[PDB]
Design a protein around this ligand. Sequence first.
Ligand SMILES: [Mg+2]
Ligand SMILES: [Mg+2]
Ligand SMILES: [Mg+2]
Ligand SMILES: [Mg+2]
Ligand SMILES: [Mg+2]
Ligand SMILES: [Mg+2]
Ligand SMILES: [Mg+2]
Ligand SMILES: [Mg+2]
Ligand SMILES: [Mg+2]
Ligand SMILES: [Mg+2]
Ligand SMILES: [Mg+2]
Ligand SMILES: [Mg+2]
Ligand SMILES: [Mg+2]
Ligand SMILES: [Mg+2]
Ligand SMILES: [Mg+2]
Ligand SMILES: [Mg+2]
Ligand SMILES: [Mg+2]
Ligand SMILES: [Mg+2]
Ligand SMILES: [Mg+2]
Ligand SMILES: [Mg+2]
Ligand SMILES: [Mg+2]
Ligand SMILES: [Mg+2]
Ligand SMILES: [Mg+2]
Ligand SMILES: [Mg+2]
Ligand SMILES: [Mg+2]
Ligand SMILES: [Mg+2]
Ligand SMILES: [Mg+2]
Ligand SMILES: [Mg+2]
Ligand SMILES: [Mg+2]
Lengths: 66, 181, 118, 25, 81
Amino acid sequence: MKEGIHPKLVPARIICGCGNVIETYSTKPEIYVEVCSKCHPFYTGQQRFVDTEGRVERFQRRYGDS
Amino acid sequence: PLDVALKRKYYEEVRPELIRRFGYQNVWEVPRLEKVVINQGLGEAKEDARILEKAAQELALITGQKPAVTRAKKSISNFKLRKGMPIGLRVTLRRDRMWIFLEKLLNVALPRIRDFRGLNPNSFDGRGNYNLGLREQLIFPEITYDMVDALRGMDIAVVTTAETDEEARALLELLGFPFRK
Amino acid sequence: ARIAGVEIPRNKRVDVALTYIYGIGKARAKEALEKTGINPATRVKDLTEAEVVRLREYVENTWKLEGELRAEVAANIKRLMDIGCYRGLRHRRGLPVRGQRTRTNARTRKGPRKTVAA
Amino acid sequence: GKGDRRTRRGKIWRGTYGKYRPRKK
Amino acid sequence: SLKKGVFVDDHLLEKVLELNAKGEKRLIKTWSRRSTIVPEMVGHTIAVYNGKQHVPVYITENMVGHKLGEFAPTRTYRGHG
RNA sequence: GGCGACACACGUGCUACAAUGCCCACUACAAAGCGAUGCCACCCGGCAACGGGGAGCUAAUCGCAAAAAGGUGGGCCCAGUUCGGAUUGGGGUCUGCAACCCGACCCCAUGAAGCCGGAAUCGCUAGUAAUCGCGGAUCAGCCAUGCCGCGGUGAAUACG
RNA sequence: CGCGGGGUGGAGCAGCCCGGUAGCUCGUCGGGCUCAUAACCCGAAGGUCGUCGGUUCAAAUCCGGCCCCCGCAACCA
RNA sequence: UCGCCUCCUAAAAGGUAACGGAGGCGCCCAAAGGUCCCCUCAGGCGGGACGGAAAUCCGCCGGAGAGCGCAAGGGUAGAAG
Ligand SMILES: [Mg+2]
Ligand SMILES: [Mg+2]
Ligand SMILES: [Mg+2]
Ligand SMILES: [Mg+2]
Ligand SMILES: [Mg+2]
Ligand SMILES: [Mg+2]
Ligand SMILES: [Mg+2]
Ligand SMILES: [Mg+2]
Ligand SMILES: [Mg+2]
Ligand SMILES: [Mg+2]
Ligand SMILES: [Mg+2]
Ligand SMILES: [Mg+2]
Ligand SMILES: [Mg+2]
Ligand SMILES: [Mg+2]
Ligand SMILES: [Mg+2]
Ligand SMILES: [Mg+2]
Ligand SMILES: [Mg+2]
Ligand SMILES: [Mg+2]
Ligand SMILES: [Mg+2]
Ligand SMILES: [Mg+2]
Ligand SMILES: [Mg+2]
Ligand SMILES: [Mg+2]
Ligand SMILES: [Mg+2]
Ligand SMILES: [Mg+2]
Ligand SMILES: [Mg+2]
Ligand SMILES: [Mg+2]
Ligand SMILES: [Mg+2]
Ligand SMILES: [Mg+2]
Ligand SMILES: [Mg+2]
């Protein structure tokens, strides 16, 4: 890497909906990540929260009782 | 730095899984991961190359390498384009610096994408490298959202010493690449 | 700071800035404010990064929002079309779906007028 | 204004009652 | 809507409930577009009437809460010029 | 089933484009008409529409009923916005044999065009024009923003 | 056959030289004024440049073929 | 039509005519020059946000069909690009 012209890329800390990624090793140490998926909310480590498909599921249910 | 968690993760627990699966007479035959090349094409900045060096500043920030600048191969009418002008930035990272970026990409960036039911699994290029592309740059940690004057995405290319997509798929899965299956 | 999807609101108010999120506003807003026991009159500019994650975690988890929400409404209508049903035709042809009158102004759902001769 | 059924004024206009124009006195 | 309700005309509701336990299923013309459809209507072919003629409609599980006159439209269009 | 069709074209209108304005809270002052096959106080349930219950009134005697703008207090801070609520998604209420075509209403989501309108063109001379609500007829219910009426506040300007 | 000019919205003409950009009048369409039509006023639509090739990054525009148009010539015999 | 360049005619040295068949020049470049160092195309297929037949990127195949200021020819990546 040519000497001049460069971000620092110095060891860091960092945060999320989870705890830390000690890994870091980036420019601009100590950053705040809004939420990740990995660390397993939101997709990975499937939460499947709020979950859909209820549209065929419902109309066949409220229907024949009424 | 030579430590870098993903690098580590690759050696203890990604390599051996891989050998168990395909099974490999040679230590070399088991896939390494070489070269993540990040390419921004910007027609966006065309007559204005002033906009450009702000975007280059941005790649550096998330890459830790300053990008070089691709200039136009031939001249083509329909969208402007003198054969002189700069089209985009392209930055090659390897070796540590690829790792320290791929980690960040896996554990921060891609999570922050609206929707994201996972990376497309057909983009393997048939000889076993993989490509994807991103719409916004603010999905990265080093970017503050107030430093974006305008959105520009990029093309990530990841080169792999695996001869096939199958193997290639395995490597990146095992590394923690979220896949839409 | 940012709530589900990207969607960063700011300054303004907290209860107001919440509307700017898709799937949310008015009622759903003043709801999650006392459900996290957060002051609505306050400005999203300043507030504890705690009551920020209090406030995000709730909303993002309570009801479905901009990404998966729009995807659902998209899928409802696709279902309504191609089933062959009459609600679905007026989606197919871009004409108003619930009653109303097409002899004169449907303009919102019809586009701008495209005139002809007499 | 008089057309938003989600307000007091809207409700009054249309002549209706609800969460935004409770019947109370 | 209805709810304490879910009205279906009994003209056909006979021949539907009948074509479940008979063992046979075939083509049935009705005028009742006011009625609701399913569950035991599914798989069955029903001919609704638009004011003009009886129209065949194949019945499936996502047609559930919908009245019969939805799948048999009342007008003719094909645009203008 | 259609009169409710929709590439379009015109008349009459309603709601707006906002800060003399929007929203929420509290607080006042009308008139005319309707209603015991109806109007429904009041208690409960419900966010609510509404539903249980359920008293009074053939009605200056009980009910529709809250008039609204206004007032006061606080909020929004000039932003396609706490403006504007058209379109659409899902959830329901009621009438009715029945609301797909075609009902009105409540709620959650959605929030479009619109930043005072080309040539042109209408009304109004005073308790009028603006603006604000209220009642009735028809009527099961309602597409009423219509129509016939009632009062609240209340200008401008006529040389000729 | 010869030399010169041309062919562009429905009509009539610019634009071609000098590559990047199609314009003007009338007509047509929608609205206004009028009892009504005309006139008049406010808006809009409408084209791939005879054609086939080639040149160039790019062709109504530059080059070639062909097809039409108009003009001039065809003398000593 | 008249001088100049390229190809054919031209009969495997040179040369060779016709109101024979076809094209071009009357410039251009202070870098499009000298040298030293490096680099290697066009095309096809596969992959990649806005990217489409074509902007940029990644992978494999690709001995020259590209490029060499402009016509053609000879030449040329073991460089002349
Ligand atoms: Mg593949
Ligand atoms: Mg490979
Ligand atoms: Mg209709
Ligand atoms: Mg409002
Ligand atoms: Mg009629
Ligand atoms: Mg009206
Ligand atoms: Mg606008
Ligand atoms: Mg209907
Ligand atoms: Mg404004
Ligand atoms: Mg006007
Ligand atoms: Mg008078
Ligand atoms: Mg009535
Ligand atoms: Mg009324
Ligand atoms: Mg012409
Ligand atoms: Mg006319
Ligand atoms: Mg006329
Ligand atoms: Mg020609
Ligand atoms: Mg061309
Ligand atoms: Mg002579
Ligand atoms: Mg030769
Ligand atoms: Mg010779
Ligand atoms: Mg010889
Ligand atoms: Mg040099
Ligand atoms: Mg190559
Ligand atoms: Mg290539
Ligand atoms: Mg490709
Ligand atoms: Mg060559
Ligand atoms: Mg040459
Ligand atoms: Mg050659």
